[PDB]
Amino acid sequence: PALDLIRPSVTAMRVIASVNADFARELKLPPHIRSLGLISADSDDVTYIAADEATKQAMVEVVAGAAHGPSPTAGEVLIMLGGPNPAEVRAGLDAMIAHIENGAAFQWANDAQDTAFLAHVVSRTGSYLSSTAGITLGDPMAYLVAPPLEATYGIDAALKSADVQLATYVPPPETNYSAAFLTGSQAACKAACNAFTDAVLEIARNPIQ
Amino acid sequence: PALDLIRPSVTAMRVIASVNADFARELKLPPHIRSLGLISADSDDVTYIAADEATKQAMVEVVAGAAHGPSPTAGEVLIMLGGPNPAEVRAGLDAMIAHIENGAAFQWANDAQDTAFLAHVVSRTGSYLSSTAGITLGDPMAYLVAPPLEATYGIDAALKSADVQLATYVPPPETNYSAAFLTGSQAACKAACNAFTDAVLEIARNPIQ
Amino acid sequence: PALDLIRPSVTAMRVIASVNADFARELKLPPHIRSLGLISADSDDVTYIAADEATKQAMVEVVAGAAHGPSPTAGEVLIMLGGPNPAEVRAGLDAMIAHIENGAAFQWANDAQDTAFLAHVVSRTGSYLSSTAGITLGDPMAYLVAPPLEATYGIDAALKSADVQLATYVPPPETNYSAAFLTGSQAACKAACNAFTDAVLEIARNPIQ
Ligand SMILES: [Cl-]
Ligand SMILES: [Cl-]
Ligand SMILES: [Cl-]
C-alpha cells in the first residue's frame, strides 16, 4: 500500500586490486587511486546515496544529470569506487551494501503501487553529493525524487513549507522520474521532506481534480 | 486496422496559483509569469501540438530535440504553462485537454498495429512551435512523425510531392520515433502529409522488398 | 545455454535512387553522394560492424557514443548508406544483410540467458569504425560489448592478458550495455577477446562472491 518501502537489490560486485596502467589513464585516475571497487544495483538514487555514504566510511571516492528512479531499473546502475588499496575499497563496498539494503528507500505513493517517490534527508553529505553546485561538504540536505509533475508541485510545496533553498535545478527532459536537492538546516530539510511527501500523496490520490 | 486513430489520455493536472520566489528564479520565469499550469499525458507529439494551440487560446507560454512517439509512453510527458494569473493558466490547460482528446492524433500504419505515425497540418502556429528555427509565428506547417526508416523515406517523398521546405532537420539518434517539420502554404503542407502517409503505409505493408 | 549465438533480424529496407535536393542539403551529403540506402535492424553493434564491412565491399559510406546492445532492441537501429548510384548502394545493403545474418554475433553469458556479450575481432577496419579516434583505416581491432560492470572488469582483464591498447574510452552513462574498442596486432586482439570473454562468463556465473 501507500508509504510502504521498496527494497532494492545488489546485482553484481567485483574488486580490481591493481588497475591496468592504460586503463588508469583512460579513467583519469589520480596517482593515489590504485584499486577499484565495482558494484551494480537495480535502483538509481538509493545507490547514489549509498555511494556518498561510503566516502565518509572509507578512503574512497566515486570515479545530478544522471538516471533517477526506483527498482527495478532498465539496466545496471554501476558505481566505481577508487581507493589507495583493496582493503579501503572493500570497506567502501561493505558500506554501500549496508546502505542499499537498510538505508534510504523509495516508497509507494498510492495503494495501487503504480507510482513511487523518495523523500530523504542526508544529515551530513560526503564528497560525492557535495560535488553538486550549492552543496557544501558536511552540510545537511533534502534528497527528493518523484515523477516530473509530482516532483515540480512537491518542490514548490517544500520551498513554501520550510526554511530551505534549492541547491541547483535542471528541469525534466519525456522522463519517468526527476530529482531535486534542497539545502538548509537538518530540521528544515526534514520539514521539506514531509511537505514534499504530502504533495505527492495528494496527486497520487487525485491526479485530475 | 491501418489508419485507425490512437487516442491518448491525460494522466495528471495541477495549478500553482503563486510560484515560490526561489523556484521562480531557478525556472528563470519572466516577471509577468506569476502562475504555473502543470499537465502530464501519455503521448509525446500530440501533447506538444496541444501546448502550442494553448498559446493562441490563452495568455500562456510554455516554460525539437525532445522525445517523440505515440501512447503509451515510458513515463510522463510534462508541459508547464506559465501565465499572468490562475484564470489564464486554467484557460490554457482547458485548451490543451480539448486538443489532446479531440485534436491531432497518431494513426496505425498497418492492420497488425505494431507501427504508428503522425501526419498533421498546423494551419496557424503559435509561440511554441514557431520557436523552432525556420518556423515563423502564424505560418502553417506539416508535423510528421514515424519510425526512423519510415520517417526518412517519407520526408524525401513529401519534399518531392509538394511545394514544401524542411524547416530544420536533426537526424535520428537507436530510436523508435523521429520527427520532421515542413514549411510552405497550407495546401502544400496537406499534400506533403498525404505523400508522407503513402510512403509509411507502403513500408508498413512490405518492409523488405 | 552459455556461449550460444544470438541471431538478429533485418526489420526494413529501402533505396532512394535520387535524394531530394533540399533533403540532401539538410543531410549535408557530399556532391558525389547521389543515392541513399536505408536499412533497419533489431541489434545495435552487429549492425554497426556490418555497416563498416559494407564500406570495403561497395562504394558507400555511412551518412562510438551511440546505443549498444543485443537484439531485440527498444526501437529501430537505422543505418543510411550513401553512394554514387543505386547499384553501389544495393551492393552495400547486400553486404550488410549477409553480415547481419552470418557475421559477428552476441552470445549468452550464462545458461539462464539474462545477460549477453560481444567479443569480436575486426581483422581489417573500413571507413566507419576507423572514424573513431585511435583507429587507423585498415588496422585490426577488438570490438567488446557487455553490461557496464562486466565490461569494465573485462576491459581491465583484456589489457592485462594481451599486447593491446584502448583506442578510446568513454565511461558508462544507468545503461544496459557499454562498448570498448581495443587496438593492436590481429593475434593480440584475439587474445584480448578470449580474456574479455572469460571475465564476463566468470561474473555471469558468480556475480556476488
Ligand atoms: Cl567522491
Ligand atoms: Cl511558448
Ligand atoms: Cl563511412
XYZ file of C-alpha atoms and ligand atoms in Angstrom, chain C residues 52 55 60-63 126-129 131, ligand 3:
12
model
C 31.739 -0.871 -41.682
C 32.302 0.332 -46.872
C 29.397 3.567 -49.968
C 29.909 5.487 -46.743
C 27.784 5.799 -43.613
C 25.894 9.115 -43.651
C 36.742 0.080 -43.070
C 35.961 3.799 -43.119
C 33.188 3.715 -40.491
C 34.917 2.139 -37.458
C 36.392 7.257 -37.856
Cl 31.974 5.638 -43.502
